[PDB]
Amino acid sequence: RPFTLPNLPLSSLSNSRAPLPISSIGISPDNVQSVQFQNGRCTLDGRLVGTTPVSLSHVAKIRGTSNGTVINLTELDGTPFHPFEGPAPIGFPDLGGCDWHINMTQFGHSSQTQYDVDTTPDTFVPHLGSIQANGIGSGNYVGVLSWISPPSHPSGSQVDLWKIPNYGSSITEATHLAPSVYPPGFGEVLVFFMSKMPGPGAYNLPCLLPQEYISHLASEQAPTVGEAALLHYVDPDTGRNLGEFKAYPDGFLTCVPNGGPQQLPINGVFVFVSWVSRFYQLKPVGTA
Amino acid sequence: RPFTLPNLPLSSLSNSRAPLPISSIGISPDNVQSVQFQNGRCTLDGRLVGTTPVSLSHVAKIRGTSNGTVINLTELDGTPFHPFEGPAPIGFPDLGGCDWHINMTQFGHSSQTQYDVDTTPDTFVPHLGSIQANGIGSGNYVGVLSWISPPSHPSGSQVDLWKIPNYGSSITEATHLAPSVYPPGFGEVLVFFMSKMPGPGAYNLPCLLPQEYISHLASEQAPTVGEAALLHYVDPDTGRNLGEFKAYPDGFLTCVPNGASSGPQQLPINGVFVFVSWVSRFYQLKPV
Ligand SMILES: C[C@@H]1O[C@@H](O[C@H]2[C@H](O[C@H]3[C@H](O)[C@@H](O)[C@@H](O)O[C@@H]3CO)O[C@H](CO)[C@H](O)[C@@H]2O)[C@@H](O)[C@H](O)[C@@H]1O
Ligand SMILES: C[C@@H]1O[C@@H](O[C@H]2[C@H](O[C@H]3[C@H](O)[C@@H](O)[C@@H](O)O[C@@H]3CO)O[C@H](CO)[C@H](O)[C@@H]2O)[C@@H](O)[C@H](O)[C@@H]1O
Ligand code: NA
Ligand code: NA
């Protein structure tokens, strides 16, 4: 059975770093070359890496018990979390460069509570299982990311969703992060799937793969994966090819702009064409 | 290419009526025969019906503009909704038998607001695009279901998530509901995938298919669908067959329980449903 990607239009799919619809395709700003996202990471043969879960019902969520001073984290199903397992429990938010506002609810209790998370202080150590409670009263909670705002520290800094948070006790501590993703060359640019994120600005959250691609690849467990997969981005009504793309084994897409992808409509489908060599040269998007 | 279901354990998947992890398999109470859920509805050949979306990022969400008295609904991306399209916009919550508490956020503004929804009054008419604001101030909002509680009317009623809400101006108005789903006979009962829902009780939300099955079937667009699919529920560790099930073309699963203390609700949730073969609608299952 040949390799496949989901036969679904991009605009019907979700971001893999928060539970938000995809609204556009984009590229990184020119002061960003590599990224190191911890959610939305899955290889073409179905290996989840970082904190990535199979399902969106786990994405950008936390679970833990507050004692009024700290929240001691668990996995989302209540299973214990230990530092050797990763930088944070599976599905923990990976949005650097902002304050988080997490909606906290409880099994067996009424009400919801907004939990305000600054990810910069020394008390923010999810790799060791603990984050500051910041006024959340004692109890067990499940929280989902709801909206974001500029970081509290350093003052005057802006929202920057190309970053990841400081999961460890310091910037030097080893937290078992998923490795960085780098542009591969050949004039190719990394492709990101973008979602609008609520909050006091025009926030756009990038990810490397839609969440439904992750569950697809994890199910498919491709027995054979070549050096790179040649894709066409196809308009499903006319069947027209809107542009050539490559997908790489580590789980990201590229194209050659002109341009691009920022201008492409979001109602297309990515279709596997064939395995090509890593250095296969793409026609610039739109061309011809 | 033969028919497939996702090769993923149930415990890694999501409910299709709210963005919640699957925690158990269940059957309905004795006084529930048919169900008429509007979300989590997809045929085996990939036809979405009711208000079902492809992606969990649309499930149990609302979008609209409040004027202080009513909320005028749209689709989640802002596109207009009209009564001919269905009982409510795509993804609108379909949990009857409870009050809803929806977390409302805004693009371009700070803060979240809890929106309390009684689905019984004459002002709750999402089929006509309008629901009461109940104190939500003027503005455009996106909301997601956060937790539930017992219905405000009739006073003292129980939480009954086997029901759907009154989408129309009365119980008699035709709102283009997806049709009911019935137990097919031959000793078989409907099988449901259950999630724990936050709120002041031990609430268990049933659905007919996990959301990741819906996106899989919608992508697969199976060209051949038989009278019924014979399935095995398989332990992925040992490969052992834990029980026989049937999947029917309209998009639901069944089994024959081996008594009351013994049935699908006692199965572990770490198994995978695997397609075996197409069988006749009358194929007699071995009890679980
Ligand atoms: C509205 C609050 O948002 C979060 O606090 C953020 C903080 O908000 C401040 C507003 O910007 C300011 O207009 C005034 O209202 O004070 C607010 C509280 O300090 O702004 C900083 C950046 O300077 C961060 O973005 C904060 O996260 C939230 O934590 C609060 O609970 C409020 O909901
Ligand atoms: C906590 C509130 O929950 C929702 O209101 C529900 C209402 O809650 C009442 C509590 O049960 C009662 O102990 C006391 O606190 O008054 C509450 C408010 O009336 O109960 C009815 C059922 O009788 C419904 O379940 C309501 O949804 C919510 O709407 C409120 O804003 C509060 O969060
Ligand atoms: Na830290
Ligand atoms: Na109504």
From Swiss-Prot, chain A:
Region P2 sub-domain, residue ranges: 51-177
Region named P1 sub-domain 2: 178-288
Region described as Protruding domain: 1-288
Residue numbers spanned by region P1 sub-domain 1: 1-50
Signal peptide: none
Job of this protein: The soluble capsid protein may play a role in viral immunoevasion.
Name of the protein in its database record: Soluble capsid protein
Species per Swiss-Prot/TrEMBL record: Norovirus (strain Human/NoV/United States/Norwalk/1968/GI) (Hu/NV/NV/1968/US)
Residues of the full protein shown: 229 to 519 of 530
